[PDB]
RNA sequence: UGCUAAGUGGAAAAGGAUGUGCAGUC
RNA sequence: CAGGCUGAUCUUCCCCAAGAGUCCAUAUCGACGGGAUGGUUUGGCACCUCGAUGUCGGCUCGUCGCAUCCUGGGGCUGGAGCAGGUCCCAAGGGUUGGGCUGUUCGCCCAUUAAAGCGGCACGCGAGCUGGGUUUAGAACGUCGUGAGACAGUUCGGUCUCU
């Protein structure tokens, strides 16, 4: 169970050995150094944390410089958590420890987690997949609208979990699985076959597949 | 039904001295 | 095997015994075997 | 008029139950009495003078019957099919302390008094506790002959 | 299905229910009898299909009497009608009382004679009891 | 001083059955 | 109209087996008779509402029960195998599109692993439609001396609310 921050860099096609066309979604995972490595004597579980990102000194709060001036790191952007299991795993680790795009071996697979795209408040149709009522034969005013919600005067009430209308994406979301195409170990790119949650440009955090 | 034969077993409960205003 | 409110054996054989709180008979012949009697 | 506490006049201290052998129920009863401050002398309903107990041992507790196997303690999310239960063998391995606290939260008062009474109670699973600073002392559970 | 021949009044209250039988209690006429330990209203359909299953086990030998007759009309009225007069005599029906008997049998053998009357009781609607002439 | 292991107590029948406690009877 | 009680009638199980199954009541059917469950049909009753509880079917959205249509696990078989029958367990998911009719139901068509049965005001009109029913127009058959009448047909017929 290994992992990596990075970006997603938009897509591409790129062609098989077998002559295929893989569509592929280009991530570049930089050199990512862990700071600080959670214990399972202090805090009750094994994790990782990793730092991502150039950031000028300035901009940086001194409550989260502080944090990196124990690492001995430069401050960096972002910075997130692998949770991994057992013990064991945390054994190679060492604060400062500056991780690469290389390890992932062509032919891996991942989860790569990201957030969603906002989609700004839908209502029923596009949220839910709901089919409207009929454009014509009558129908007054009634187009994209929800229809009923709810029986009668028994129960007298909206359950909870009822399907509406609200602000739809920026869901933290994952793909699984996902075939890695081909690690590209300069330039410090993953080729990714399929499509990657987020914009062009949000933070990805890829991972080897717990199913896999 | 359940209802119609739950209110009649009200009549046994000791304050009740096995006769209860049905209606 | 034949469940039912009503057992009864059929061959002298068949035992009558009960199981975890129900009554069942069992004999050589596997189609004399009866449940919740 | 007669008395009542105008405050400070709260002694409170502490108590410390072992279950081990003993039996929920006459536990969380003889536990619920030391709550609300009814073996106090003095005792007014509107105000508590409930002393402090802390419950140790809390998987060891005999429930007896089969009620390990058949007793359900059901909660309900809000939603449509929510309706989980939960053995009390299960949950007692899963969660030791629930199975002491749940008997004894509903054998109190029930109003906003009453969730004032839930902080005076604590429950253990293991025999340690980390309130040995206060120096509580062992209350076993007794019968006054009648 | 045995009915009366000329009923003097072919519409009558029900037939009063409560009490024990003073008579005839005990077993008159053959070795086995069957005594009722229940109120009950038993229909000449109950009492025909009771005999029958005497006299299928039985097969050929021994002999059944009746002391029950039906005699009594039991109104009925159309199950389509509103809530007007009396309506029609359905059934025909014999008031059994506990401590009455029913059924008697006069067969030599001891298990075919109590289990020959053992049909005859889930046939009925009472709970009854097997009983003997000694 | 006894009974009940079924949460029976804390719903129900015609029936079915080596569950069990007492008082009878070859 | 809907709720309430009732459960004759309906509905799902059950007691006893006369039997039919070559023989063999209980693989599978089970007459005659008896005992209950369910409230889902037709009813009985008149308890809430007539200073209004607004209306069948369809669409939209569902939610729960299991008496399981399919998939999953079992016993028995008059179970060789394949494919069944029957009974027990099980509610996680899935249960198609058209033809005719206002229809519900139903008959059919081509498929499907399967085309389940019910409750929720026979779910859902301050969510929609208005084909059906049930105002005023009008003709047909019928009954009426006549005005007119008919859960007899026929064509037309305002759906309010920040
Ligand atoms: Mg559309
Ligand atoms: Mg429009
Ligand atoms: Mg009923
Ligand atoms: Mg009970
Ligand atoms: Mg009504
Ligand atoms: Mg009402
Ligand atoms: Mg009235
Ligand atoms: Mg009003
Ligand atoms: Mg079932
Ligand atoms: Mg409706
Ligand atoms: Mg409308
Ligand atoms: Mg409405
Ligand atoms: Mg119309
Ligand atoms: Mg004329
Ligand atoms: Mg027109």
């Known amino acids: 169970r290994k992992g990596i921050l990075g970006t997603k860099l938009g897509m591409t096609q790129v062609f098989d050995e077998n002559n295929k066309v893989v569509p592929v979604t280009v991530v570049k995972a930089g050199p990512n150094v862990v700071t600080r490595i959670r214990t399972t004597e202090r805090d009750g579980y094994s994790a990782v944390q990793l730092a991502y990102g150039e950031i000028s000194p300035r901009k940086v709060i001194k409550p989260v410089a502080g944090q990196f001036a124990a690492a001995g790191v430069n401050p960096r952007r972002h910075v997130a958590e692998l949770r991994l299991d057992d013990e064991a795993a945390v054994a190679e680790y060492e604060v400062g420890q500056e991780l690469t795009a290389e390890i992932f071996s062509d032919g891996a697979y991942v989860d790569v987690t990201g957030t969603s795209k906002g989609k700004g408040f839908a209502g029923t149709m596009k949220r839910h997949g709901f089919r409207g009522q009929g454009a014509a034969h009558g129908a007054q005013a009634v187009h994209r609208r929800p229809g009923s919600i709810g029986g009668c005067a028994t129960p007298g009430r909206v359950f909870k979990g009822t399907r509406m209308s609200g602000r739809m994406g920026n869901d933290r979301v994952t793909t699984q699985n996902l075939k890695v195409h081909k690690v590209d170990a300069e330039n410090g790119v993953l080729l990714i076959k399929g499509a990657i949650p987020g914009r062009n440009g949000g933070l990805v955090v890829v991972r080897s597949a717990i199913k896999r | ?23 | 095997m034949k469940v039912n409110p009503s057992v009864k054996p059929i061959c002298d054989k068949c035992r009558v015994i009960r199981r975890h709180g129900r009554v069942m008979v069992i004999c050589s012949d596997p189609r004399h075997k009866q449940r919740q009697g | 008029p007669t008395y009542t506490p105008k405050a400070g006049d709260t002694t409170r201290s502490w108590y410390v139950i072992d279950a081990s052998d003993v039996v929920l129920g006459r536990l969380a009863s003889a536990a619920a009495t030391l709550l609300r401050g009814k073996h106090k002398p003095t005792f007014t309903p509107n105000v508590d003078g409930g002393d402090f107990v802390i419950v140790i041992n809390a998987d060891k507790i005999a429930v007896s019957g089969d009620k390990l196997t058949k007793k359900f303690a059901y909660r309900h999310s809000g939603y449509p099919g929510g309706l989980r239960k939960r053995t009390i063998g299960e949950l007692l391995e899963k969660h030791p302390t629930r199975v002491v606290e749940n008997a004894i939260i509903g054998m109190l008062p029930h109003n906003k008094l009453g969730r004032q009474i839930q902080k005076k109670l604590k429950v253990y699973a293991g025999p340690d506790h980390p309130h040995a600073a206060q120096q509580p002392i062992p209350f076993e559970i007794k019968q006054v002959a009648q | 299905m045995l009915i009366p021949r000329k009923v003097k009044h072919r519409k009558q209250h029900h037939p009063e229910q409560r009490g024990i039988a003073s008579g005839g209690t005990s077993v008159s006429f053959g070795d086995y009898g069957i005594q009722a330990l229940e109120h009950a209203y038993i229909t000449n359909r109950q009492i025909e299909s009771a005999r029958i299953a005497i006299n299928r086990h039985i097969k050929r030998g021994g002999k059944v009497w009746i002391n029950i007759f039906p005699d009594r009309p039991l109104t009925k009225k159309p199950a389509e009608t509103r809530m007007s007069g009396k309506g029609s005599p359905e059934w025909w029906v014999a008031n059994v009382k506990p401590g009455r008997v029913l059924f008697e049998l006069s067969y030599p053998d001891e298990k075919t004679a109590r289990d020959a009357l053992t049909r005859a009781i889930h046939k009925l609607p009472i709970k009854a009891r097997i009983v003997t002439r000694e």
């Open chain 2, 1 to 23: 039904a359940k209802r119609g034969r739950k209110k009649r077993d009200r009549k046994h409960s000791k304050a009740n001295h096995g006769k209860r205003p049905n209606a």
